[PDB]
From a paper:
The E. coli 50S large ribosomal subunit is composed of 33 proteins (L-proteins), one 23S and one 5S rRNA. The 23S rRNA consists of six architectural domains that, stabilized by the L-proteins, define the shape of the 50S subunit with its three protuberances. Here, we present a biochemical and cryo-EM based analysis of the earliest period of 50S assembly, utilizing an in vitro reconstitution system with purified rRNA and L-protein components. Taken together, early 50S assembly occurs in a domain-wise fashion, while late 50S assembly proceeds incrementally.
Residue numbers in the entry:
A (entry chain 2): 10 to 44
B (entry chain Q): 1 to 117
C (entry chain L): 2 to 27, 70 to 137
D (entry chain R): 1 to 103
E (entry chain E): 1 to 58, 71 to 201
F (entry chain U): 1 to 102
G (entry chain J): 1 to 75, 86 to 142
H (entry chain S): 1 to 82, 98 to 110
RNA sequence: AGCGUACACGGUGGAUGCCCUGGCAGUCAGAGGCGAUGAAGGACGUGCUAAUCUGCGAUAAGCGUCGGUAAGGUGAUAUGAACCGUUAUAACCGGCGAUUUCCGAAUGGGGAAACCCAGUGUGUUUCGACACACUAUCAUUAACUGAAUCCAUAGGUUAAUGAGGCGAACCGGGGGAACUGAAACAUCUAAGUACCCCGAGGAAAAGAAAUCAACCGAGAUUCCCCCAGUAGCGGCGAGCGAACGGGGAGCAGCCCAGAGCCUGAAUCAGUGUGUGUGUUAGUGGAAGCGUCUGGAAAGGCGCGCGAUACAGGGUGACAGCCCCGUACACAAAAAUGCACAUGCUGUGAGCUCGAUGAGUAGGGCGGGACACGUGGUAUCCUGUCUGAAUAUGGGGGAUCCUCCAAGGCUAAAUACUCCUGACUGACCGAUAGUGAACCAGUACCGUGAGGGAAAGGCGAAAAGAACCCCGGCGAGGGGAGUGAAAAAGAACCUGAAACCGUGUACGUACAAGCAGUGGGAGCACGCUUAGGCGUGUGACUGCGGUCAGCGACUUAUAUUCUGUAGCAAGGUUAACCGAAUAGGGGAGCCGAAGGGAAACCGAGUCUUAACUGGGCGUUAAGUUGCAGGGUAUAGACCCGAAACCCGGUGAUCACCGGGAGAUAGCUGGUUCUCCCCGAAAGCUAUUUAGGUAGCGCCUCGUGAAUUCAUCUCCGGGGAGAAUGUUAUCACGGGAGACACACGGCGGGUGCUAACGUCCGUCGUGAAGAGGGAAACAACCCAGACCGCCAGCUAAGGUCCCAAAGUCAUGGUUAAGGGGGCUAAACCAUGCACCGAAGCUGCGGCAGCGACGCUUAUGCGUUGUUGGGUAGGGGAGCGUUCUGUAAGCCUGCGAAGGUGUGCUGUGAGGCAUGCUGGAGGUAUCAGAAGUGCGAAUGCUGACAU
């Protein structure tokens, strides 16, 4: 549960920098955005 | 205008190797040493094209001297007699007649002795 | 006949490509000058402070000009009322 | 019967019939040249050169064809300076058949 | 000089400096080369070592020596157009016309037209004149002739104002109508 | 529309059967067609006791390009191309060479 | 044509007999080496053993002038004891001294046959007499 | 006549199979079989199987006279890597 | 007048530039070459300058 | 079939849809899994008919 | 027993050749947003399904209506089962709709994304559950409630609207570095660059003078070419950079300021009708046969036909006439953009007077921040008061010149492409092009941001090997059969090298250091009818990590020179228009006149008061394109650091992306042939020791007095003969060297030794091969254009090793590289001989001068020259692509692979055997991703 509590989708989406990271992931087109 | 260098490079390597056959393994198969072996063989051939004249001159002189000694005259005295007898026969022909027919060489040496004095 | 066409000898050079192989080697602003050819025949080129800009011979805003001579004299142009160099009276009148 | 004659600066001892190799000589293929120079004639009692350039001996020979020798690759370059210079050489030659030897 | 009309045996007066000047080989070659180079569409590009996707300096992967790396001197889209002086162009056209006149590759006719836009009529007309690969230059372009000649690959049709140095060379024979001859004479001065 | 339809007498213009007539069985969606006895293949079917195995070598009919078959008309005995023409209400095929409606 | 080359298959060699009594070691050995090498014959060829077999008799009769009887040393004995025990060894070493180094040189040297007594088992070969 | 039989992509080292193949090259099949029978080397089984297959192919595809068959050309070639596999080849012919 | 004969005898590789210039003036551009010369004191001095490598006859 | 039942009222559309679904879907799914029903035509046919009825029954009565 | 060599036959290998459903770079048009009526992107399902792509969403490869089309169809892999339809309800295409699970701004609460858990209202009910809507925040409007505070408000509730998030560039605004370079801090550049945040846009911003200029005058904003890389700024250094004006694309100026006169007047935006023109499906659409090869014809051969269609693609090899197509002519139930006349709602044609923007400028008073600190110091605001008239007045630069602010708006030309359709390419063709032609941002690596690959081809058609046999009911293989081919078998076009094997012929087993080269027997195969001939090996003898691919002086802007072409005292266009490589455009730039400090003069010109000073020019032609040799700036021929900053991810014990192709210094590498000439490591001043500016040597082109060198005489430079291809000097382009070593001679210093020092003579090597002294760059002879199984010689030698005198005429000598020599040693003489790549003899090639045929070559010759490092000059070979080229070769056999022969001084070229099975390309020109043997180079394979 440690991995999800920090790198999980909700935790990443919570902060603006995580939103930017997810946007970059979407732009690149990776199969899995978070895990 | 991209050009692939494969064809010309392979042709050049094949041409270089075609004249390096029989060089004890690597020097006949590895290009990096085959080229050096070919160059060295060429240089040795260039030197030997000249050394051949020296070697054959020495062999002819030895044969002429050996034939003359059978007739009781040394090579230097035989050459002196031929020169003073106005004989233009070359050493190659002298050696050839000496090794083929002895009567001709006996006549040569007798004539050389006659004009020696 | 596009095949036959070819340039003159020495026109195009290959251009050396070094690094390939071993055997391949490697008051002033308003001052101007008038020449005899200038205003030689401009259909009304009478010497004057005007009718010189229109002919488009020297500048646009030029207002002062001389009669300096540089060879090629073939017109008996008469100069009066404008500056004339001391040496200009020999060839202009000839 | 073998005759010794010089044509291109080197003497050749040639027996009757057998063809011999000589330098290039400006003579037509059909023409039959006479070698006015003879240095020896061989018989039961061979006649020696009483005087150089025996005038009494003349060799008759006919040229069959000209040509070039085997290709020779010469590397004038030396000293091992990582340079390649393989020039080619093919010396001109003429094969001549000799018929008739005069003593 | 005088050009035989081939139909009325009437000569056409044309300036010697236009249809009779000496053939300047170098000028014509330069003009045709410039015309060919002007048609180039230099649309190409390669990725330099700073454009190939990647990152890091663990030397660098994007170096030209490395596989899948950038090109050492990657090209960029460039314009190959070459300036040609008006005087040089006119001189080249005059020289080409004079050479065509000398080699009898140029013929003049009264009027060249067909009744209807039918390729069969044009083919028959060219056959009657023993013409297979020709450039017909005219004045006011005729719709019928233009439509008829469009399909025939060997035959081309154009107006006097649309002639080019390459066109007058690549085609075996040129048929300039009298009106076209006058128009070209005026254009070349 | 389609120039070749079911049960149309055709002649194979090219491809090992120049002149052999036939009758079209079906037309494939990829542009090929199957005709009666023009292309015979000797398929070596894998045996299967069930599913009604034909047995041994199956001498069956292969598919050929539609471009290699031309409609055959008994009026002249030679294959000729077929175009489309509008009737009063419908569209019908007709050969060339005097436009004889099919 | 090409200069004649001796064929080892058809080399003609004739036996010879040489007596060493009253002859200098150096000069006799030099003559022997010249005869073994085949240089005397007109058919001499550097790469072919065209010489002839030679038999040396009375090796103990070797004569050398000067004080060489003590100076000479072969391998650390002295010349006197060696001539007393094995006269043939002196001649053998001398002749070896005048021949090329290599398998051909050894082959040529093997032809020489040196003995102290006049009698020899090779008389069945009709060895010719040679003078020096 | 000449009968071929080969095994491709064998799971064995080329040198190991060659060690066994050299023991029968130029030998008669009648003795080759019983020589390979008692050989304890692993490649012996593979070589024996290939030789038996060659003999069977000669039998079915030829008339008779299996006794006189001789091992003429037997060789092992290097094969594709992943432990380099080996291609064994045996040729049996009466003459 | 009387014409003298001069023939180069020895090489000139290991010689001073003055000797080489003298040989060039004498016309001896190759060893063994035989050339004619006139009878003047200049020729005498030229021969005297280099005599260990030339012969006069 | 597609349009003949368009004129049918909403109540009978409801009843026929209920019958078709609750009977055919269950029966086909059960027999389709028990090894029976060698033919799959009915499986698609019933689903398509149910979809067609579903498209009606909303605009006809205003949903 | 192994090893080496050559040939034949095989395996891993996947280079090379041919091909494209993939990319790269651009042109022309559309469009520039999507979403709480639930976006971008995902999870799970859905078919008769074991799996993937695509479609779709519990109505789940689909549903309803209307049109086109229809005899086939139910999407594909990759088939099968089961089914529908065939003349109008099969299927396919398009318009309009219905359905549209869950996560995701997620929005009823919770949470670990696709999960769990509730309330209210309504329908249904098997009265248990089920089915639909709402239940997050802020802001705004109407209403009801509603404390401080009676009313009223803040707040709550109800009804309605907007935002919440995603997205490539462009626009505005606010933040905002560092490395580095300028002779060196500061300063500037770096750079308002990198990077961060907010906003609407289809474009944005700006847009109409209280502007400039000078007494002539331009007149809105934005953009392009000149002016001009000019004036100017700048430790006048790197570097930064104008304006006026001229030529162009667009050219539109308006409204209110508050009243009056006839009214609602034209125009404007919205709201409907009718036509035309498109978009979203579509219909018609010309004209070939025989023959010969050939698996197959579209190829050759003969004769016909269409062409407003010879653009293109497929079809058993290359198709105008086989098919789809193209030109052309037509087509719309429905939705939709544009252009019109039309009923209607709102700003309302035109004239007059006002007004001309007021608590405003100005006056200040004190600050801060604009890099700008009072420094040369300009600028925004107030915490704060005052405050002027309305053209007769005010602002800016006493006269004079221009405008009427403190109110507002304004399309046009202008920047970019996330996306849509067409087209094009001297762009690439699987180690290229994108990282990705294939199930790629996948496998895989890291907890994380992030990093990130390898991998194409059977065949025309699977006709994908029935059947038999070995084997374990395997893997694999041998037959049979299909196929033109199985030398196409699913590891499937072509199939090279390294590497590993079998057979044949030859040679060879103690440590040499080379396994090469000249001679050369022997052995096996073919000649030849013998001549010692070719191939394979090489006893003996003189001399003496690998393979294939990729990878490096390119491009842009200025300046100088050379060759070449047009015009010529003229040359020449840029932007732009354009019938678009034509023509127009002379705005603009260079030159024709220089001298002179400026001034001034002028084919003449100055200094001093003028020169007994020397002028500087004309008489030499400049300009515009093309190609090339240099220089400078950009990354600058290619590869190779530590460090600093910014934005993020982890503190489970710093890392990822970007500035950045950073910046230094110093190594390493730089790929085809031939010919001619051919260096240097030395000197002067500076010396911020970085070097610099010159001198000096080399080469090429031009000019020059016949210049210079050697020898003689005369005088302490002058004259005279011949020889030297001007070897002499000047000009211009381009170089290299700029740390030289050794040694004889004359030295200073000194062991009166020097390889410590720098000089003039120099010779050797660098950059010169060969002979001799055993070898040995420094000792002597001697400068290799090529071939010859020719001769004569120099230094040195003549007993053997080892070619040549045990030579002769007289003496001395007992000392003893190898044996040894009593002369086979030393001192002299003579005749000889050996002795090099020196010289000569024959043949052959190339450069440079003169004389006579030809005036480009080709000849009688004449002669001469031809070692070469760095460097300069000249002439050529090779590969991709473009025009020539719809021409030519080519299925009777292309490209490629592999042998042979011929040919060229060589780079290379031609023919042909086998394999290969469809492309290649002559001649002449044009453009290069153009030539590999190393860069601890990279990729794959093979070794160890």
């Amino acid at each position: 549960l440690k991995r999800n509590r920090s790198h999980g989708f909700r935790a990443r989406m919570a902060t603006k920098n995580g939103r930017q990271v997810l946007a970059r992931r979407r732009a690149k087109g990776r199969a899995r955005l978070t895990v | 205008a991209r050009v692939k260098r494969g064809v010309i490079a392979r042709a050049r390597h094949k041409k270089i190797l075609k004249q390096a056959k029989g060089y004890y393994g690597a020097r006949s198969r590895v290009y990096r040493v085959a080229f050096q072996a070919v160059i060295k063989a060429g240089q040795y051939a260039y030197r030997d094209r000249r050394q051949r004249k020296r070697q054959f001159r020495q062999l002819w002189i030895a044969r002429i001297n050996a034939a003359a000694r059978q007739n009781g005259i040394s090579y230097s005295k035989f050459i002196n007699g031929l020169k003073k007898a106005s004989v233009e026969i070359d050493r190659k022909i002298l050696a050839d007649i000496a090794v083929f027919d002895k009567v001709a060489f006996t006549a040569l040496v007798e004539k050389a002795k006659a004009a020696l004095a | 006949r596009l095949n036959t066409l070819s340039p003159a000898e020495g026109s195009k050079k290959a251009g050396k490509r070094l690094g390939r192989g071993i055997g391949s080697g490697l008051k002033a602003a308003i001052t101007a000058e008038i020449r005899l050819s200038d205003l030689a025949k401009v259909e009304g080129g009478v010497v004057d402070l005007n009718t010189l800009k229109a002919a488009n011979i020297i500048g646009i805003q030029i207002e002062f000009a001389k009669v300096i001579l540089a060879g090629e004299v073939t017109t008996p142009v008469t100069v009066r009322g404008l500056r004339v160099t001391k040496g200009a009276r020999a060839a202009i009148e000839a | 019967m073998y005759a010794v004659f010089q044509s291109g600066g080197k003497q050749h001892r040639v027996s009757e019939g057998q063809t011999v190799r000589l330098e290039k000589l400006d003579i037509a293929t059909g023409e039959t040249v006479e070698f006015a120079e003879v240095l020896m004639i061989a018989n039961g009692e061979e006649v020696k050169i009483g005087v150089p350039f025996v005038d009494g001996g003349v060799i008759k020979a006919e040229v069959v064809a000209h040509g070039r020798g085997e290709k020779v690759k010469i590397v004038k370059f030396r000293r091992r300076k990582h340079y390649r210079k393989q020039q080619g050489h093919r010396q001109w030659f003429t094969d001549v058949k000799i018929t008739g030897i005069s003593a | 000089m005088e050009l035989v009309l081939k139909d009325a045996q009437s000569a056409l007066t044309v300036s010697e400096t236009t249809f009779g000047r000496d053939f300047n080989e170098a000028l014509v070659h330069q003009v045709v080369v410039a015309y060919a180079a002007g048609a180039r569409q230099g649309t190409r590009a390669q990725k330099t070592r700073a454009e190939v996707t990647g990152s890091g300096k663990k030397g660098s992967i994007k170096s030209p020596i490395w596989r899948s790396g950038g090109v050492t001197f990657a090209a960029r889209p460039q314009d190959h157009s070459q300036k040609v002086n008006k005087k040089m162009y006119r001189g080249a056209l005059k020289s080409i016309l004079s050479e065509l006149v000398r080699q009898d590759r140029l013929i003049v006719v009264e009027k060249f037209s067909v009744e209807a836009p039918k390729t069969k009529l044009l083919a028959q007309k060219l056959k009657d004149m023993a013409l297979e690969d020709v450039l017909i230059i005219t004045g006011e372009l005729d719709e019928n002739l233009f439509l008829a000649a469009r399909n025939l690959h060997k035959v081309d049709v154009r107006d006097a104002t649309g002639i080019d140095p390459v066109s007058l060379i690549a085609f075996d024979k040129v048929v300039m109508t009298a009106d076209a001859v006058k128009q070209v004479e005026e254009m070349l001065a | 529309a389609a120039k070749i339809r079911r049960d149309d007498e055709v002649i194979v213009l090219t491809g090992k059967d120049k002149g052999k007539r036939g009758k079209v069985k079906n037309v494939l969606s990829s542009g090929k067609v199957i005709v009666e006895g023009i292309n015979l293949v000797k398929k070596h079917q894998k045996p299967v006791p069930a599913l009604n195995q034909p047995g041994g070598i199956v001498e069956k009919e292969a598919a050929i390009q539609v471009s290699n078959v031309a409609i055959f008309n008994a009026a002249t005995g030679k294959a000729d191309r077929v175009g489309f023409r509008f009737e009063d209400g419908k569209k019908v095929r007709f050969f060339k060479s005097n436009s004889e409606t099919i | 044509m090409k200069t004649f080359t001796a064929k080892p298959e058809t080399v003609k060699r004739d036996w010879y007999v040489v007596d060493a009594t009253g002859k200098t070691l150096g000069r006799l050995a030099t003559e022997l080496a010249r005869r073994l090498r085949g240089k005397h014959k007109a058919e001499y060829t550097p790469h072919v053993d065209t010489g002839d077999y030679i038999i040396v008799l009375n090796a103990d009769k070797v004569a050398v002038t000067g004080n060489k009887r003590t100076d000479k040393v072969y391998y650390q004995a002295t010349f006197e004891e060696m001539i007393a025990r094995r006269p043939e060894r002196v001649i053998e070493i001398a002749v070896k001294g005048m021949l090329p180094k290599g398998p051909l040189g050894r082959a040529m040297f093997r032809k020489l046959k040196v003995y102290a007594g006049n009698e020899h088992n090779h008389a069945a070969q009709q060895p010719q007499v040679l003078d020096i | 006549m000449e009968t071929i039989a080969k095994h491709r992509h064998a799971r064995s080292s080329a040198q190991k199979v060659r060690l066994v193949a050299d023991l029968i090259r130029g030998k008669k099949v009648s003795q080759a079989l019983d020589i390979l029978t008692y050989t304890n080397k692993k490649a012996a089984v593979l070589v024996k199987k290939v030789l038996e297959s060659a003999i069977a192919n000669a039998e079915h595809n030829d008339g008779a006279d299996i006794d006189d068959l001789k091992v003429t050309k037997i060789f092992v070639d290097e094969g594709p890597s992943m432990k380099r596999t080996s291609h064994i080849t045996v040729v049996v012919s009466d003459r | 007048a009387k014409t003298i004969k001069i023939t180069q005898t020895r090489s000139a590789i290991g010689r001073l530039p003055k000797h080489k210039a003298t040989l060039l003036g004498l016309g001896l551009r190759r060893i063994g070459h035989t050339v004619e010369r006139e009878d003047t004191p200049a020729i005498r001095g030229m021969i005297n300058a280099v005599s260990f490598m030339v012969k006069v006859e | 079939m597609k349009a003949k039942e368009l004129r049918e009222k909403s109540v009978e559309e409801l009843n026929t849809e209920l019958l078709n679904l609750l009977r055919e879907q269950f029966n086909l799914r059960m027999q389709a899994a028990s090894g029976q029903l060698q033919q799959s035509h009915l499986l698609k046919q019933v689903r398509r008919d149910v979809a067609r009825v579903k498209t009606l029954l909303n605009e006809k009565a205003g949903a």
